[PDB]
């Protein structure tokens, strides 16, 4: 019966994020010499050019991590991450200007990525 | 004296600490604003004494203990932050979880 | 991937089924529903979600479903529910309650809650958010009272006065066209919403009505100006024509009538009965019986709230001091003993808990405390839980029913009573964005940030010279919403329809938002949210014992309250 | 008759060749030239020179070369020189720098500096007079920050915010047309010059541009809103069309790119790089390399200024606190160690001394101290003199070159960067009379009197109840320039050309002087007075060591600073 | 600390009482504002100590006597009123004719 | 109490002097505003004690000596001025070069 003012008494159970969406695991490496940290809601194909991964597997996806968190890649670090699907209209505008429309346009996205030197366009 | 706005405000912290210290001395368990005032004034006086930021981050956790304060007060105070003029100019001290 | 509930609540605030303690009370509120899509929660900061192309949309102009302001992850406590949502504000009004962000990439975004280039963000994760308090019993006596009110989450002051004149120190009255005009002009500099009451006294209609036409928003009948059958009658005839509310402080002395005579003069018309328990004024000893009637909108003032061991001693003397009574005048002593009654004060606690008294109010500076309406509401609810148990209506564990009953007393109900609930009084789409953020540890005690018309007006914030705003001293301070001409756009002056039609704002050069008082005469007790009970209240004229449904309503005074010495420096 | 130099300086302030110590620093400034005619010095008082028929002309009307205000015997410290002159003000602007008095009887009177019936006098003998500080990195979080700024001689605040909303607590952004309008209205009550930055984020032009048309004076790109290649690009396209400046806080996380990618997006366009050293934000670890580029206008924020023994401990924790980081999240720890770097902070001291970082700024209340921009500029210069010696450019004895280099950092250079140096930022004929008087013993620490538009706005002055104004307590206080409608004429709201052309001031009822932002897009590093150096700055990605011209730039932190515990009560 | 407006104001009463107490201790007969400050601070500290309103109404009449104050001061002070946070929330104490 | 504006302001001088005196007592050399506060409060308390203006002009030069203050502080303080209520009403005391 000690009172902590304003304390929570949370319910039992756990919260599943991004429920019902396809999940994909991919390996990613920071080929650069400075650290790269990637937020939960950036269109994954549009991350820093010097991250090497199968760029196609980043299209229409973002990290499957709690909203507002990030994945960190030290220089030279390679690790696996899990991605989830973008939702809503599944359109991306701005960021690196690789999409500017539907994420369904994989060929166009990859063409732009390749031309601009985003590593890992296969 | 050429008091600036912060010097005027911060006099009030010293005063509140003096009040709280009198309450503690007559045997009262201190409340939330009293505890904050005491620890804050301690930090500012410590800067004036020429202690380092790192010293004050450590010392600030030993100014008041849970038996000095009312139930729940330790858990109400996540940190106390204060800026003061050190020998090397104004710096911020943050004391994390000052009362266990 | 799953997150445990403790960690989820720490990051985003609580979600469905989680409970939160209100300050250091025994009261727990439970999240009833949550508008989010788990994984797509909005948040702002370095590497967070509300960034261009991500949770912030980079395409749409402001007009295109974009918000001016998003409060993320709010725990809303309101008569409408206790639930988790983002709140979206535009043009100073609440335009969406739901889920904000970017439909490009997020699921479940409410269509008019786009975070875009135009959008400011306030993080409400881990905060309780309520409507601004509506205080309908304000004496305008000392301008320093405004900050006192804001600091405890009050955003609308309805009442009267011209400063520390004896009429105003006694009564919520700004008398006559000239004093009303002067105080409307003064109001241009007060950083809070305001409505002004005229003197509800006269035996001819014109002297009363000209106050309404001059810009008053209502009337106050007060015994100190003669709460006679005639003044009651004329005031209500005016109010019925003008569509404004009348508040009453009745004839304590029973000089021209007893309670039944006042009720006969009212003749079934709608009236707001101030300090209905009666320590603050009214027919001795039985005024509180007003609260049983269907045409009465009953409020308490705060010094009797709740019943404590010091209440009587304090009031017996308070009464003596402010009425300039003498211990050596037997009439004055008998008067005080007839007016300050533990029997009715104790029953008042219970009548609140039963939903028979519908509203709280301060009585600021004229037997009431400007910054304690919200505070004492929750202290009352806590005392009632301790003494009467969880209400029968509660769904196991939580105090949600009680919390909705009590929050309604100082938010929606006074707004409905005054004819201003189209603008203020609750967190609902289409209403003015008067919002109060509270840390749960300080809930009901000291507001974190008070938003007025969509801009922060008052905040507990620290050293203005510091590197960040959190270092000491953290104190209540006026924010940019109160500065310059922004004070005009963030606050409402409520006025009668007739004064608005007659162009009073232009005549006086009023630049504040102008609110119309309406729909005051077609309401009753049944319209008081969660507090709609009508019943026959019997008050024994000999013993002052209060009975409802044949049961004596009594409870004990308490020696200690929550929301008290843990928090206050004095 | 001859006067010895000591006595001359005591009576009239110093003259040619005399030196004055800056506060308790080791820095000495030398009078380079003097506009007076010895024997005809202006002075005011009983039996003094500025009297009718004598040093005051009794013939001419105000329009006829007469001044509204003469500051007598000022020691001017400015990018244009360090020299002795009278300063003449008329219609709120500096109209003459030279020699004031009466051509009837005095030799050498500047023709438009007649002291006449219309002329007020401020005695500046023994004072140092500078331009008001131009702070271009202001978060509008707490209105109490304005007096803090005035007290340390700042007269213009450029930045953004809506009060203590999370967006504003992180970023210098007032987002969207509505928030911009609201803050323009708030600005009517702030006794300081102001310009407001919109959100430099979006992937379409219209959402960004509508902020400029609404009255923003510039844009801020901030990583917390997504400092992506797209947002950078669109903001600069808008700025190039609108002729306003863009400030940037780049992508620390290197999420969408490294420094080179941000530079590619900028594509040679002009940009103001905030807190270029990077503890305050930006591409880790090499952001400071921005300061080598010809299209970059680089500023520091003040908490790293200068490098001291407590700086790192303080910042590592400051960062942790304000970003809500956890010691038990390895990413957050690695993030802090990548962002707070003694190697780059030490190099920042040197880069200032070399003229490679051109500007200072506060970062008020969002990792920066509102009242310490001027203070820390001089503490930096003093540390550099102690550690690096007199600069090679100095003419024996004095620190004039260093003093002009450093005063430029907080006066003229930020004004040029923002497109407002036609109005403010230096003591020159034709510019607004924003002037700060300092006693040399308090120079850079506490301003004596702050003149805004030719009227004193803030002063260190004593007991208002006393026989004279000097008795205790002497404290900073708002003066008549801040009262009533005079606040409108003594301060400038800076706005975009498009908003001015579209009549925004009239639409919003703005009564302040309206300043036009212009000539922001056609400038570069070469235009930064005394701080125009371009070079290749190499930052080692492993060790964070900074090299210029193949030399490692390093220096030691100091345990003590001047302008510190001798002066401050806390 | 989260100081509200009244907490800030009431710090000044404590300060004025401390000033007055120093004056009394060096042998001065106290004046009107000094006497009011001492009695007011006594009431507020008493509330903080957990005394009742009724206790403070009684005790407040014994804090200063006529020999502690200047001529006429007892007759100038008809009553002293103060509000403070008791264990049961804010209450008003009125001390009638505190100095006989 | 009926505090007027000057009474409120001047409470702050007393407070700052009390702060400074605590700093001096723990062995610190006093700075510019500390020294000014101590001497100013001394003057005002002296008026309250009923000393003459002439007495205070003399005594004010002996409150602090150069060894009590930091380097340069004596030369920073050309004079200290204070007004207070003497037995014969408000008067101005100016202490010239208070610290040699
Ligand atoms: F009343
Ligand atoms: F009342
Ligand atoms: F920032
Ligand atoms: F920043
Ligand atoms: Ni009443
Ligand atoms: Ni009343
Ligand atoms: Ni920044
Ligand atoms: Ni900033």
Residue B71 has phi, psi (to 5 degrees) of -50, 135
Tokens of D231: 């947002």
- Measured over the CA atoms of residue C149, residue C153, residue C155 and residue C157, the dihedral's sign is negative
CB atoms E90 and C372 under 8 Å: yes
Per-residue CA distances from D267 to D204, D233, E43 (Å): 18, 8, 71
Would you tell me how many other CB atoms lie within 10 Å of the CB of residue D377? Answer: 26
Bridge partner residues of C461 (DSSP): C475
Q: Which of C441, C463, C568 sits opposite B6 (nearest CB)?
A: C463
CATH code of the domain containing C437: 2.30.40.10
Listed in sequence order, the DSSP H helices in D323-359 are 330-339, 342-353
Report the distance separating Cα C486 and Cα D179, nearest Å.
11
Supply the range of the domain harboring residue C238. 132-425+484-570
Q: What is the four-CA torsion angle of D503, D507, D512, D516, rounded to 10 degrees?
A: -20
My answer on whether D293 and D385 are in the same domain is yes
Cβ-contact C535, E65 below 8 angstroms: no
Q: Does B4 touch chain D (CB under 8 A)?
A: yes
> C473 preceded by cis ω (within 30°)?
yes
Q: Which stretches of chain E sit within 8 Å of chain B by CB?
A: 1-3, 7-8, 11, 14-15, 18, 45, 48-49
Q: Which domains does chain E have, with CATH numbers?
A: 2-100 (3.30.280.10)
Report the distance separating Cα D506 and Cα D138, nearest Å.
26
Report the distance separating Cα D362 and Cα D134, nearest Å.
10
Tokens of D134: 């131009």
Q: Measured in whole angstroms, how far is the alpha carbon of residue B66 from the centre of its chain? A: 15
CB atoms D569 and F4 under 8 Å: no
Judged by its nearest atom, the ligand closest to the C-alpha of residue C364 is 6
Element (H, E) at F34: helix F32-49
Q: Which domains does chain A have, with CATH numbers?
A: 1-122 (2.10.150.10)
My answer on whether D45 and D189 are in the same domain is no
My answer on whether D144 and D61 are in the same domain is no
Tokens of C494: 């409520």
Q: Which of B2, B8, B11 to mutate to test the interface with F (most CBs of F within 10 A)?
A: B11
Among residues D483, D512, D527, the one where a domain terminates is: D483
Report the distance separating Cα C332 and Cα D263, nearest Å.
84
Cβ-contact B51, D521 below 8 angstroms: no
Tokens of D113: 């500096």
Cβ-contact C448, C127 below 8 angstroms: yes
Report the distance separating Cα D8 and Cα D15, nearest Å.
8
Question: 3-state DSSP call for residue A38?
Answer: strand
Q: Ligand 7 centre and the CA of D274: distance in Å?
A: 6
Cβ-contact D263, D289 below 8 angstroms: no
Residue C271 has phi, psi (to 5 degrees) of -150, 150
Q: What is the DSSP letter of C227?
A: -
Element (H, E) at C69: strand C69-78
For chain B, give the number of residues: 100
Report the distance separating Cα C134 and Cα C306, nearest Å.
19
Between β-strands D133-139 and D154-160, what pairing exists: parallel, antiparallel or unpaired? Answer: parallel
Number of domain units in chain C? 2
Chain B positions touching A7 (Cβ under 8 A) are: 75
Per-residue CA distances from B2 to B15, C59, C189, C201, F5 (Å): 20, 52, 31, 56, 19
Question: 3-state DSSP call for residue D56?
Answer: strand
- Measured over the CA atoms of residue D369, residue D370, residue D375 and residue D377, the dihedral's sign is positive
Question: 3-state DSSP call for residue C303?
Answer: helix
Catalytic residue, chosen from C201, C323, C324, C352, is: C323
Report the distance separating Cα C10 and Cα C219, nearest Å.
48
Report the distance separating Cα D528 and Cα D413, nearest Å.
6
Cβ-contact E24, E6 below 8 angstroms: no
Report the distance separating Cα B88 and Cα D305, nearest Å.
11
Q: Any residues with CB less than 8 A from the CB of C334 and at least 6 apart, and which?
A: none
Cβ-contact A47, A97 below 8 angstroms: no
Residue D19 has phi, psi (to 5 degrees) of -115, 155
- Measured over the CA atoms of residue D106, residue D111, residue D113 and residue D116, the dihedral's sign is positive
- Measured over the CA atoms of residue D132, residue D133, residue D138 and residue D143, the dihedral's sign is negative
C222 is in an annotated binding site: yes
Report the distance separating Cα B68 and Cα B74, nearest Å.
10
Report the distance separating Cα C551 and Cα C540, nearest Å.
12
Tokens of C523: 């309401």
Q: Ligand 8 centre and the CA of D380: distance in Å?
A: 21
Q: What is the DSSP letter of D326?
A: -
Helix axes D205-214, D176-187, angle to 10 degrees: 20
Q: Any residues with CB less than 8 A from the CB of C408 and at least 6 apart, and which?
A: C79, C358, C528, C529, C530, C531
Residue D535 has phi, psi (to 5 degrees) of -165, 165
Interface of A with B in 3-32 (CB under 8 A): 3-5, 7
Element (H, E) at C241: helix C229-242
Judged by its nearest atom, the ligand closest to the C-alpha of residue C173 is 6
Q: What is the DSSP letter of C405?
A: H
Strands (E) across C223-317 are located at 245-249, 271-273, 296-298
Q: Does B72 touch chain A (CB under 8 A)?
A: yes
Tokens of D45: 């008082």
Catalytic residue, chosen from D272, D323, D352, D488, is: D323
My answer on whether C85 and C195 are in the same domain is no
Cβ-contact D405, D530 below 8 angstroms: yes
My answer on whether C212 and C196 are in the same domain is yes
Helix %, strand %, coil % for chain F, to 5?
A: 55, 20, 25
Question: 3-state DSSP call for residue A16?
Answer: strand
Which is nearest to C97 in space by CA: C120, C75, C113?
A: C113
Q: Does A82 touch chain C (CB under 8 A)?
A: yes
Q: What is the DSSP letter of A39?
A: E
Chain A positions touching C47 (Cβ under 8 A) are: 37, 39, 68-70
My answer on whether C18 and C5 are in the same domain is yes
Cβ-contact D69, D88 below 8 angstroms: yes
Would you tell me how many other CB atoms lie within 10 Å of the CB of residue C185? Answer: 12
Q: Which long-range contacts link D61-65 to residues 24+ away (Cβ below 8 Å)?
A: D61/D116, D61/D117, D61/D118, D62/D116, D62/D117, D62/D118, D64/D114, D64/D116, D65/D111, D65/D112, D65/D113, D65/D114
Element (H, E) at D9: helix D5-12
Q: Which long-range contacts link D53-56 to residues 24+ away (Cβ below 8 Å)?
A: D53/D104, D54/D102, D54/D105, D55/D101, D55/D102, D55/D105, D55/D106, D55/D115, D56/D101, D56/D102, D56/D115, D56/D116, D56/D117, D56/D119
Report the distance separating Cα C570 and Cα D405, nearest Å.
52
My answer on whether C363 and C391 are in the same domain is yes
The burial of E33, by beta-carbon neighbours within 10 Å (0-12 exposed, 13-18 middle, 19 or more buried), is given as: middle
Among residues D434, D451, D483, the one where a domain terminates is: D483
My answer on whether C217 and C316 are in the same domain is yes
Which is nearest to C512 in space by CA: C526, C491, C495, C496?
A: C491
Report the distance separating Cα D288 and Cα D538, nearest Å.
9
Would you tell me how many other CB atoms lie within 10 Å of the CB of residue D400? Answer: 22
Report the distance separating Cα E20 and Cα E28, nearest Å.
9
- Give the neighbours of chain D: at least 3 Cβ pairs within 8 Å: A, B, C, F
Which is nearest to E85 in space by CA: A4, C381, C310?
A: C310
CB atoms B11 and F19 under 8 Å: yes
My answer on whether C186 and C287 are in the same domain is yes
The distance of D331 to chain B (nearest Cα, Å) reads: 20
Tokens of A61: 């996806």
Which is nearest to E56 in space by CA: E96, E29, E20, E22?
A: E96
Report the distance separating Cα D276 and Cα D284, nearest Å.
11
Bridge partner residues of C460 (DSSP): C476
Among residues C435, C462, C483, the one where a domain terminates is: C483
Q: Does A48 touch chain D (CB under 8 A)?
A: yes
Q: What is the DSSP letter of D31?
A: -
Question: How far apart are the two ends of chain D, measured CA to CA in Å?
Answer: 49
My answer on whether C420 and C447 are in the same domain is no
Tokens of C495: 């006025």
Which is nearest to C322 in space by CA: C284, C358, C266, C365?
A: C365
Helices (H) and strands (E) in chain C, counts: 16, 24
Between β-strands C218-222 and A61-63, what pairing exists: parallel, antiparallel or unpaired? Answer: unpaired
CB atoms B15 and F15 under 8 Å: yes
Between β-strands C193-199 and C154-160, what pairing exists: parallel, antiparallel or unpaired? Answer: parallel
Region of residue C65 (left: phi > 0; alpha: psi -120 to 50; beta: else) = left
Per-residue CA distances from C419 to C238, C272, C292, C422 (Å): 15, 11, 21, 8
> C306 preceded by cis ω (within 30°)?
yes
CB atoms F1 and E26 under 8 Å: no
Q: Measured in whole angstroms, how far is the alpha carbon of residue D325 from the centre of its chain? A: 32
Would you tell me how many other CB atoms lie within 10 Å of the CB of residue C14? Answer: 27
Cβ-contact F36, F80 below 8 angstroms: yes
CATH code of the domain containing D208: 3.20.20.140
Element (H, E) at C185: helix C176-187
Cβ-contact A39, A87 below 8 angstroms: no
Q: Any residues with CB less than 8 A from the CB of F62 and at least 6 apart, and which?
A: none
My answer on whether D549 and D506 are in the same domain is yes
Q: Which stretches of chain B sit within 8 Å of chain F by CB?
A: 1-3, 7-8, 11, 14-15, 18, 45, 48-49
Q: Any residues with CB less than 8 A from the CB of D378 and at least 6 apart, and which?
A: D22, D23, D25, D27, D406, D443, D444, D562, D563
| CA contacts within 13 A on the Cβ side of D527 | 21
Report the distance separating Cα D196 and Cα D181, nearest Å.
10
Report the distance separating Cα C189 and Cα C147, nearest Å.
13
Report the distance separating Cα C15 and Cα C19, nearest Å.
9
Chain B positions touching C567 (Cβ under 8 A) are: 31-33
Taking only Cα atoms into account, the Rg of chain A, rounded to an integer number of angstroms, comes to 17
Tokens of C381: 């609810």
Cβ-contact C105, C54 below 8 angstroms: yes
| Cα D96-D102-D108 angle, rounded to 5 deg | 65
Between β-strands D245-249 and D271-273, what pairing exists: parallel, antiparallel or unpaired? Answer: parallel
My answer on whether D100 and D229 are in the same domain is no
Tokens of C527: 């319209």
| Cα D142-D145-D149 angle, rounded to 5 deg | 160
Q: Measured in whole angstroms, how far is the alpha carbon of residue C456 from the centre of its chain? A: 18
The distance of D181 to chain C (nearest Cα, Å) reads: 9
Listed in sequence order, the DSSP H helices in chain B are 5-25, 32-49, 53-59, 73-76
Residue with tokens 């004004």: D415
Chains B and F touch (3+ CB pairs under 8 A): yes
Q: Which of E8, E90, E93, E97 to mutate to test the interface with C (most CBs of C within 10 A)?
A: E90
Resolution to 1 decimal, in Å? 1.6
Active site residue C283: no
Binding-site residues from annotation of D for substrate: 139, 170, 222, 249, 366
Cβ-contact C341, C285 below 8 angstroms: yes
The distance of B40 to chain D (nearest Cα, Å) reads: 12
Report the distance separating Cα B55 and Cα C533, nearest Å.
62
Q: Which of D472, D568, D569 sits opposite F82 (nearest CB)?
A: D472
The distance of B60 to chain D (nearest Cα, Å) reads: 15
Question: 3-state DSSP call for residue D1?
Answer: coil
CB atoms D229 and A49 under 8 Å: no
Q: Does D512 touch chain A (CB under 8 A)?
A: no
């Amino acid at each position: 019966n000690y009172i902590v003012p304003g304390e929570y008494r949370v319910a039992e159970g756990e919260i599943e994020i991004n429920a019902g969406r396809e999940k994909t695991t991919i390996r990613v490496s920071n080929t650069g010499d400075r650290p790269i940290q990637v937020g939960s809601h950036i269109h994954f194909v549009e991350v820093n050019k010097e991250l090497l991964f199968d760029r196609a597997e980043g299209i229409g996806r973002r990290l499957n991590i709690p909203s507002g968190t990030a994945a960190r890649f030290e220089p030279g670090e390679e690790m696996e991450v899990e991605l989830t699907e973008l939702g809503g209209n599944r359109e991306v505008f701005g960021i690196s200007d690789l999409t500017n429309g539907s994420v369904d346009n994989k060929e166009l996205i990859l063409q732009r990525a390749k031309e601009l030197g985003y590593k890992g366009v296969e | 004296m050429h008091l600036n706005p912060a010097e005027k405000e911060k006099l009030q912290i010293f005063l509140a600490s003096e009040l709280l210290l009198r309450r503690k001395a007559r045997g009262l368990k201190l409340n939330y604003p009293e505890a904050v005032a005491i620890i804050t004034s301690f930090i500012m006086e410590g800067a004036r004494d020429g202690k380092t930021v790192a010293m004050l981050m450590e010392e600030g956790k030993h100014v008041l203990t849970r038996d000095d304060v009312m139930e729940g007060v330790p858990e109400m105070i996540d940190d106390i932050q204060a800026e003061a003029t050190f020998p090397d100019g104004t710096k911020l001290v943050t004391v994390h979880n000052p009362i266990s | 991937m799953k997150i445990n509930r403790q960690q989820y609540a720490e990051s985003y605030g609580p979600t469905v089924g989680d409970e939160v303690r209100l300050a250091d009370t025994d009261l727990w509120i439970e999240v009833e529903k949550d508008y989010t899509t788990y994984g797509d929660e909005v948040n702002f900061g370095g590497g967070k979600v509300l960034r261009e192309g991500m949770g912030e949309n980079g395409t749409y102009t402001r007009t295109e479903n974009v918000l001016d302001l998003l409060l993320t992850n709010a725990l809303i406590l309101d008569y409408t529910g206790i639930y988790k949502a983002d709140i979206g504000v535009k043009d100073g009004y609440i335009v969406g309650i739901g889920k904000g962000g970017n439909p490009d990439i997020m699921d479940g975004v409410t269509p008019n809650m786009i975070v875009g280039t135009a959008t400011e963000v306030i993080a409400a994760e881990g905060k309780i958010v309520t409507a601004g308090g509506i205080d309908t019993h304000v004496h305008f006596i000392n301008p320093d009272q405004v900050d006192v009110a804001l600091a405890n989450g009050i955003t609308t002051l309805f009442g009267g006065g011209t400063g520390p004149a004896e009429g105003s120190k006694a009564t919520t009255v700004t008398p006559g066209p000239w004093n009303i005009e002067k105080m409307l002009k003064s109001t241009e500099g007060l950083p809070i919403n305001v409505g002004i009451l005229g003197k509800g006294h006269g035996s001819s209609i014109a002297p009363i009505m000209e106050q309404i036409d001059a810009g008053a928003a209502g009337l106050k009948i007060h015994e100190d100006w003669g709460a006679t059958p005639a003044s009651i009658d004329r005031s209500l005839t005016v109010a019925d024509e003008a569509d404004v509310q009348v508040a009453i402080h009745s004839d304590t002395l029973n000089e021209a009538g007893f309670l039944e005579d006042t009720l006969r003069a009212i003749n079934g018309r709608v009236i707001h009965s101030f300090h209905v328990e009666g320590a603050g004024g009214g027919h001795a000893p039985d005024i509180m019986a007003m609260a049983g009637h269907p045409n009465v909108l009953p409020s308490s003032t705060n010094p009797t709230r709740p019943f404590t061991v010091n209440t009587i001693d304090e009031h017996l003397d308070m009464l003596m001091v402010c009425h300039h009574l003498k211990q050596n005048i037997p009439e004055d002593v008998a008067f005080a003993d007839s007016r300050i009654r533990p029997e009715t004060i104790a029953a008042e606690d219970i009548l609140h808990d039963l939903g028979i008294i519908s509203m709280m109010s301060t009585d600021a500076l004229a037997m009431g405390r400007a910054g304690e309406m919200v505070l004492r509401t929750w202290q009352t609810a806590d005392k009632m839980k301790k003494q009467r148990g969880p209400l029968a209506e509660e769904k196991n564990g939580s105090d949600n029913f009680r919390l909705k009953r009590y929050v309604s007393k100082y938010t929606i109900n006074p707004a409905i009573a005054q004819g201003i609930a189209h603008e203020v009084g609750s967190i609902e789409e289409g209403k003015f964005a008067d919002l109060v953020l509270w840390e749960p540890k300080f809930f009901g005690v000291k507001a974190d940030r008070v938003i007025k018309g969509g801009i922060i007006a008052y905040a507990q914030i620290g050293d203005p010279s510091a590197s960040i705003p959190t270092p000491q001293p953290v104190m209540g301070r006026r924010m940019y919403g109160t500065v310059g001409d922004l004070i005009h756009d963030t606050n409402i002056t409520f006025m009668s329809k007739s004064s608005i039609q007659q162009g009073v704002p232009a005549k006086l050069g009023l630049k504040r938002r102008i609110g119309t008082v309406k729909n005051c005469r077609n309401i009753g007790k049944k319209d008081m949210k969660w507090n709609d009970v009508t019943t026959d209240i019997d008050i024994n004229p000999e013993t002052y014992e209060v009975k409802v449904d044949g049961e004596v309503l009594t409870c004990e005074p308490v020696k200690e309250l929550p929301m008290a010495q843990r928090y206050f420096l004095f």
